[PDB]
C-alpha cells in the first residue's frame, strides 16, 4: 500500500509517534517519505547480505528475522515479512525500539540526509490531524 502524506501522518499520530522520544510527527512522515516514498511494500537489498523492509526500511541484520542475513540479532523479535504489512503497526513498534537503541532517528540514513534539521513540520502542514 502506498500511503498518502496526511493519511500516514494521521496513522503515525494514532500510533504514538508524535514526539516519540522527542521527535515531532514531521520527522517520522519525512523519514517514511525518503526511506520508502510511503510504500509499505518497499524493500531494499544491500551489499552485506541484508535487506531493508517496509514503510521505514527496517534492516534484517539487527532488527527483524528473514533467515538469510549474517550476524542477525532480530532485536525487534519479529519476521521481516511482518514488516511488509498494509497497516504500519509492526513497523512502528520496531521503530520505537530502534530509535531507543542509542542513536535516535540517526539510525535511518535517509532521515539524517534529507530530514534532520529541516522544516519537517512541513510534512503535516495541510493535514487535518
Amino acid at each position: 500500500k502506498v500511503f498518502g502524506r496526511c493519511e500516514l501522518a494521521a496513522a503515525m499520530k494514532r500510533h504514538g509517534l508524535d514526539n516519540y522520544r522527542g521527535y515531532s510527527l514531521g520527522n517520522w512522515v519525512c523519514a517514511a517519505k525518503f526511506e520508502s516514498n510511503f510504500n509499505t511494500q518497499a524493500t531494499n537489498r544491500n551489499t552485506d547480505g541484508s535487506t531493508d523492509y517496509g514503510i521505514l526500511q527496517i534492516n534484517s541484520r539487527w532488527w527483524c528475522n528473514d533467515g538469510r542475513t549474517p550476524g542477525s540479532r532480530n532485536l525487534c523479535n519479529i519476521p521481516c515479512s511482518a514488516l511488509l504489512s498494509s497497516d504500519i503497526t509492526a513497523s512502528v513498534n520496531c521503530a520505537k525500539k530502534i530509535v531507543s537503541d542509542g542513536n535516535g532517528m540517526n539510525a535511518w540514513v535517509a532521515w539524517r540526509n534529507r530530514c534532520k534539521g529541516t522544516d519537517v513540520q512541513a510534512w503535516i502542514r495541510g493535514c487535518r490531524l
Partner: antibody
Amino acid sequence: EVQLQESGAELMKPGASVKISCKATGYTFTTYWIEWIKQRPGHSLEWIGEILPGSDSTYYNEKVKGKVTFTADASSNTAYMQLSSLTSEDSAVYYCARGDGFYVYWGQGTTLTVSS
Amino acid sequence: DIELTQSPATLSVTPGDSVSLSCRASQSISNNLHWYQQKSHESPRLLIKYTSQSMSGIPSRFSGSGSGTDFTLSINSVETEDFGVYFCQQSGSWPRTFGGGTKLDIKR
C-alpha cells in the same frame, strides 16, 4: 526435515508460457525467501529472482523479468514461477531454494524443454 | 553484478592427493561466499558456508578459506566419490551470482 518439492518435466512450444511449482515444508513458510535459479549446460548457474511467500514481495533479475512472474499460495506452502513467451533460450533446469544466504535446501529441479 | 571467476575449469586428481579450487570476486563480498558440489542430474549440495563454515554432516576433508575477493576451497585426501562439479556463490549482493564451476575427475 525442510523439503522443497517441484513440479515435473515440462514441454512447451515457443511463445507459450509455463508455471513451475515449489511446495516447501518443514519450516515457517512466510518467513523465508524462496529463490529461483536457472541452470543450462555450458552455462553458469543463474539467479532468476525471489519471492517472500505471503507478503506479496518479489524481486527480479531482468535477464528474466519482463518474462518471469512469481506468486505464492500460503494455504498450501507453494511458490510459483511463471515464464512467458518461451523460446529455446528458456530451455533449462530450474531450481527453487530457500533463502539462507547460502542455499542448503534445494527443490529437486524442474526441466523445461521449449521446442516446436 | 559481482562476477565470480572460478579457476581452473577442470581438475584430474589421484585418490589421497589434496587439491585447491579458486574463486575470485570482481568486488569485495567480505565472507559472504559459499561452496557447493553437484553430481549429474542432482541438486547442488552445500559443502562450505560463509567462506569457512563447514556445513554439518560434510566430510572433514573439505576446508574453505579466503576473504574479500579471493577464496579457496580445499579438498584434502580426495576420494573416488568426490568426482563432480564444484561451485562458489556469493550472497553479499543481489542478484546472487555463481562461479562458472570446476569439474573434478578422478585420476586412475
